[PDB]
From a paper:
By contrast, in vertebrates the clustered protocadherins (Pcdhs) provide analogous cell-surface diversity, but in this case generated through stochastic alternative promoter choice. Biophysical measurements with domain-deleted proteins showed that Pcdhs also interact in cis, through a membrane-proximal dimer interface involving extracellular cadherin domain 6 (EC6) and potentially EC5. The specificity-determining cell-cell recognition interface of Pcdhs involves domains EC1–4, as shown experimentally through mutagenesis analysis and suggested by mutation correlation analysis.
From these experiments we obtained crystals of γA4EC3–6 and γB2EC3–6, which diffracted to sufficient resolution for crystal structure determination. X-ray diffraction by the γA4EC3–6 crystals was significantly anisotropic, and therefore anisotropic resolution limits were applied. The resolution of the final refined structures was 3.0/4.3/2.85 Å for γA4EC3–6 and 2.3 Å for γB2EC3–6. The two structures are similar overall (RMSD of 3.02 Å over 405 Cα’s), although γA4EC3–6 shows a more pronounced EC4–EC5 bend angle (32.6° for γA4 vs. 18.6° for γB2). These are the first Pcdh structures containing EC6, which displays the classic beta sandwich fold, but with a large insertion between the A and A’ strands. Notably the G-strands of both EC6 domains are decorated with O-mannose groups on neighboring surface-facing residues, three for γB2 and four for γA4. The γA4EC3–6 structure did not show any protein:protein interactions consistent with cis interactions in the crystal which, given that this γA family member is monomeric in solution, was expected. Furthermore, O-mannosylation is observed at EC6 G-strand residues 624, 626, and 628 (γB2 numbering) of both the γB2 and γA4 structures—on the opposite molecular face to the mutations that disrupt cell surface delivery.
Numbering used by the authors: 210 to 243, 247 to 539, 544 to 638
Write the structure that this text describes.
């Protein structure tokens, strides 16, 4: 009779990743009469013909083309058998393909937002993306990941549609740009990830003013100073960017000695270098109060004020004046009967400067009769040091020198003519 298969249908359950040529199964037919047995496909299917290879003699079924679960999951194959002339025996072969997580998730970004205002309202849609995975089961479910520390809340809009919203108010002065990476994680083991990142640039509002490094300033200038002298350097900082962060310096206008402030001090608008336009004579005025403003470009401008206090330092640049005596007989008198210590005269002198530069000391330089008189060091009193004698001359002359105590010191000289009275 006809041959007999060991089973009218053969089953197998294999994974889709089975290498080509791997033996799938083996079909057996036997003749019961007492040989040569043919094994051939029955109704050849083009997909089944490409995907499965069997020879007649071995009767083994091996893989000819890679099986993709995503293409087809079940195969119904018709097989028969010949003994030569006799009736062809029929038998089915059923191949169950299993799913292997061999497709990482594919993320398609539908909408996006590439810029956001600093003081913007939270809740703006940053991105609306959808993820699709070709695999099946838990190998096909997908989760969307965003860095944890970054303060935003991501939620799923509907089904596999997700939204990326702003949970925390944004401020440009913290970080400039963003490289936000959403990583798609597969649930099937081992998991397969596919990450996609989006770029962003933060809009910058002019909401911060320029701030000075010190709440108040104070500089010092010598009395005489060159034209265009470098007095100070001022610097203010603006945490913004672009036009909204440039600094421009100005000197608020006041009046000194009836003259505008622009007469003595200028500032460079770009570099806070304070320049002195004239020399500040200490005996004319000692100090001036200034106000420095710093603004930014763009609209509207945003500025700040700082209180500068400029002080001129005195310099010994004035010789003492001897107001007494001047060129009334220039001759002072002294009695012949004058006791020791008689106040003959007293030198009067002043000094335009201040402090040690206005500290006068008078000393005796030259005397017609040496031990007769005495000049008070700090009072300038010309007095008698001894009693007068008949030998002493009728007309006397002293040379007094007035010194200031500055650095370096300056002196003056005066000759006193003192007549001896009788
Ligand atoms: C965002 O950052 C990632 C890094 O986390 C960047 O990825 C780099 O890409 C270059 C170019 O192909 C690779 O050579 C590096 O290996 C990647 N860095 C890694 C893996 O850490 C990505 O290009 C950035 N994109 C934007 C828009 O900023
Ligand atoms: C600067 O002037 C503004 C108003 O013009 C004022 O609000 C501010 O207090 C002033 N600066 C200082 C340090 O007082
Ligand atoms: C010019 O130079 C002086 C030093 O001589 C600085 O102190 C000033 O700030 C400016 O830079
Ligand atoms: C601001 O910039 C000036 C330059 O003009 C410096 O001299 C100052 O010390 C501050 O850094
Ligand atoms: C008065 O005295 C001072 C200091 O002794 C001198 O520097 C000056 O020239 C004048 O003679
Ligand atoms: C006082 O005396 C001195 C002498 O050294 C002169 O140099 C000066 O001009 C003043 O007459
Ligand atoms: C007064 O006269 C004397 C001369 O003894 C000078 O030395 C002095 O400088 C001042 O002219
Ligand atoms: C007496 O004479 C002297 C010059 O010898 C003067 O310096 C003095 O002021 C007074 O006239
Ligand atoms: Ca596959
Ligand atoms: Ca698969
Ligand atoms: Ca997958
Ligand atoms: Ca801000
Ligand atoms: Ca800003
Ligand atoms: Ca600003
Ligand atoms: Ca002077
Ligand atoms: Ca002076
Ligand atoms: Ca002086």
């Amino acid at each position: 009779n006809a041959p007999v298969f060991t089973q009218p249908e053969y089953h197998i359950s294999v994974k889709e990743n089975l290498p080509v040529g791997t033996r799938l199964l083996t079909i057996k037919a036997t003749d019961p009469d007492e040989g040569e047995v043919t094994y051939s496909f029955r109704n050849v299917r083009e997909k089944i013909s490409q995907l499965f290879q069997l020879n007649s003699l071995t009767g083994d079924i091996t893989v000819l083309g890679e099986l993709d679960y995503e293409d087809s999951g079940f195969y119904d194959v018709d097989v028969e058998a010949h003994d030569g002339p006799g009736l062809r025996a029929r038998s089915k072969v059923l191949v169950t393909v299993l799913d292997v997580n061999d497709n990482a998730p594919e993320v398609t970004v539908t909408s996006l937002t590439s810029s956001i205002q600093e003081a913007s309202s939270p809740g703006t849609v940053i991105a609306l993306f959808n993820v699709h995975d070709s695999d099946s089961g838990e190998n096909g479910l997908v989760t969307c990941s965003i860095p944890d520390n970054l303060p935003f809340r991501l939620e799923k809009t509907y089904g596999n549609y997700h939204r990326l919203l702003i949970h925390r108010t944004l401020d440009r002065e913290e970080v400039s740009d963003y490289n936000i990476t959403i990583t798609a994680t597969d649930q099937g083991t081992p998991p397969l990830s596919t990450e996609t990142y989006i770029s962003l640039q933060v809009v910058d509002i002019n909401d911060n003013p320029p701030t000075f490094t010190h709440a108040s300033y104070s500089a010092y200038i010598p009395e005489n100073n060159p034209r265009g002298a470098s007095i100070l350097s001022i610097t203010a900082q603006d945490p913004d960017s672009g036009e909204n962060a440039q600094v421009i310096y100005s000197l608020s206008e006041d009046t000194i000695q009836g003259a505008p402030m622009s007469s003595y001090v200028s500032i460079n608008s770009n570099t806070g270098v304070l320049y002195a336009l004239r020399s500040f004579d200490y005996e004319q005025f000692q100090d001036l109060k200034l106000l420095v403003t710093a603004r930014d470009s763009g609209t509207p401008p945003l500025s700040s004020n700082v209180s500068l206090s400029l002080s001129v330092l005195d310099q010994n640049d004035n010789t003492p004046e001897i107001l007494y005596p001047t060129i009334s007989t220039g001759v002072e008198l002294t009695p012949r009967s004058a006791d020791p210590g008689y106040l003959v005269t007293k030198v009067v002198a002043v000094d335009k400067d201040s402090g040690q530069n206005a500290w006068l000391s008078y000393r005796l330089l030259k005397a017609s009769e040496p031990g007769l008189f005495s000049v008070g060091l700090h009072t300038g009193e010309v007095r008698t040091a001894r009693a007068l004698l008949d030998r002493d001359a009728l007309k006397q002359s002293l040379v007094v020198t007035v010194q200031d105590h500055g650095q370096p010191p300056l002196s003056a000289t005066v000759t006193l003519t003192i007549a001896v009275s009788d």
